[PDB]
Amino acid sequence: STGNPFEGYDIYLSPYYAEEVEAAAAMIDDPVLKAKALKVKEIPTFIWFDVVRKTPDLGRYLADATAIQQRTGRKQLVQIVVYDLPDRDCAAAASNGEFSLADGGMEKYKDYVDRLASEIRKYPDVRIVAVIEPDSLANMVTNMNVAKCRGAEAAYKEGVIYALRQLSALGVYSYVDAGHAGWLGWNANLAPSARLFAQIYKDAGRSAFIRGLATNVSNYNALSATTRDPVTQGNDNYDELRFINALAPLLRNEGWDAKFIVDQGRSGVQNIRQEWGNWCNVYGAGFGMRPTLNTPSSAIDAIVWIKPGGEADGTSDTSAPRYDTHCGKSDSHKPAPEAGTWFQEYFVNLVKNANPPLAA
Ligand SMILES: O=[N+]([O-])c1ccc(O[C@@H]2O[C@H](CO)[C@@H](O[C@@H]3O[C@H](CO)[C@@H](O[C@@H]4O[C@H](CO)[C@@H](O)[C@H](O)[C@H]4O)[C@H](O)[C@H]3O)[C@H](O)[C@H]2O)cc1
Numbered sequence: 507s508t509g510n511p512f513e514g515y516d517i518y519l520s521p522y523y524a525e526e527v528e529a530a531a532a533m534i535d536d537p538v539l540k541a542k543a544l545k546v547k548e549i550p551t552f553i554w555f556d557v558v559r560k561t562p563d564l565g566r567y568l569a570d571a572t573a574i575q576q577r578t579g580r581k582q583l584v585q586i587v588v589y590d591l592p593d594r595d596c597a598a599a600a601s602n603g604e605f606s607l608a609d610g611g612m613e614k615y616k617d618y619v620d621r622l623a624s625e626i627r628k629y630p631d632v633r634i635v636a637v638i639e640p641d642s643l644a645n646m647v648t649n650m651n652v653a654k655c656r657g658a659e660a661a662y663k664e665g666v667i668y669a670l671r672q673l674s675a676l677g678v679y680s681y682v683d684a685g686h687a688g689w690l691g692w693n694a695n696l697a698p699s700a701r702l703f704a705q706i707y708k709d710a711g712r713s714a715f716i717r718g719l720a721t722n723v724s725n726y727n728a729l730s731a732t733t734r735d736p737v738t739q740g741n742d743n744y745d746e747l748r749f750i751n752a753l754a755p756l757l758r759n760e761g762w763d764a765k766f767i768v769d770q771g772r773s774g775v776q777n778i779r780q781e782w783g784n785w786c787n788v789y790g791a792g793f794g795m796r797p798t799l800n801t802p803s804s805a806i807d808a809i810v811w812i813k814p815g816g817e818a819d820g821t822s823d824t825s826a827p828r829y830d831t832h833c834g835k836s837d838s839h840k841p842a843p844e845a846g847t848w849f850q851e852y853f854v855n856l857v858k859n860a861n862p863p864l865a866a
């Protein structure tokens with residue numbers, strides 16, 4: 507289709523996240539904060555498939571969404587994240603991941619995608635929006651000095667193209683991850699990013715199902731900054747809107763008229779980072795701008811909550827195999843559990859600090 511893929515759809519509410527929120531609310535003693543916590547389970551989030559053992563769960567969500575659709579007659583849209591490349595998260599320790607290129611990682615990744623595809627095939631009547639491999643391509647632009655990233659370059663591109671070709675053949679709408687304003691928004695990185703995204707789009711066959719890009723995944727940038735965050739100094743693109751408005755024309759000239767979705771899940775509190783490159787469980791974050799199709803620009807299909815607030819970005823335990831020093835910074839919330847696991851203290855702050863505030 508030509509238009510906004512989200513238009514006219516009810517957004518399927520993650521049962522995984524609802525259950526986490528339900529249990530989290532139960533542990534909050536403040537009745538006001540408890541009631542606000544419970545509102546969060548009604549806010550649409552993206553469902554991450556960060557491990558291949560989760561692929562059968564996609565079938566379960568799509569069956570559930572299909573049943574809701576058939577019961578109510580209201581079209582359902584399921585939001586998912588493809589996040590399992592071999593040598594994943596190559597500039598960091600926190601979200602390492604289960605596949606290694608040293609151990610048949612590439613083939614195992616294709617199989618992971620194939621399993622995702624086999625579930626989608628069983629439930630063709632539900633629309634799916636997928637974010638493709640957060641951080642992957644952003645690392646390819648910026649971190650070829652990092653041995654793991656340099657070694658992963660061919661596999662990242664191959665893997666992302668495979669996923670895109672396989673999902674596009676199933677009518678899945680993809681948004682390829684594109685870092686954020688403080689990553690690829692820098693003039694050092696814009697043009698090279700535009701070139702890379704255009705290349706992936708091309709090699710993936712230029713399917714109309716490849717709708718565009720996703721920004722600010724698991725990050726904290728403002729969409730449109732009322733006051734400039736001191737941490738953004740030197741970068742003219744100091745919010746996601748500016749980043750996108752600088753990127754979109756470049757990418758267009760490079761052969762792709764791309765549309766955008768923006769994570770605002772943990773963007774409610776600005777001015778909370780000592781450095782812009784600090785990403786791990788940043789202290790005092792709040793739930794941000796709610797998912798909506800009323801965006802400030804025609805390039806932007808939707809504001810979304812891609813990273814589900816409350817799930818950790820990485821362990822702060824200096825003894826743990828996945829310990830990354832970003833997770834030990836003075837402006838990280840500590841002690842933090844393993845990436846992807848529930849982080850109660852952190853969730854409690856997101857609710858309390860939410861902007862706009864959550865209602866009862
Ligand atoms: O003015 N100049 O002249 C000039 C010259 C060169 C410049 O270089 C740029 O400097 C930037 C910092 O300003 C760097 O941005 C940081 O890069 C990190 C990766 O190394 C990212 O971390 C990821 O974050 C993800 C969540 O978003 C995590 O999920 C993931 O695990 C984690 O790895 C940070 O967000 C991101 O902010 C750029 O790479 C770098 O190219 C900049 C300016």
Ligand SMILES: [Mg+2]
Pocket residue numbers: 693740741742
């Ligand atoms: Mg500058």
Ligand SMILES: [Mg+2]
Pocket residue numbers: 601724819845
């Ligand atoms: Mg992460």
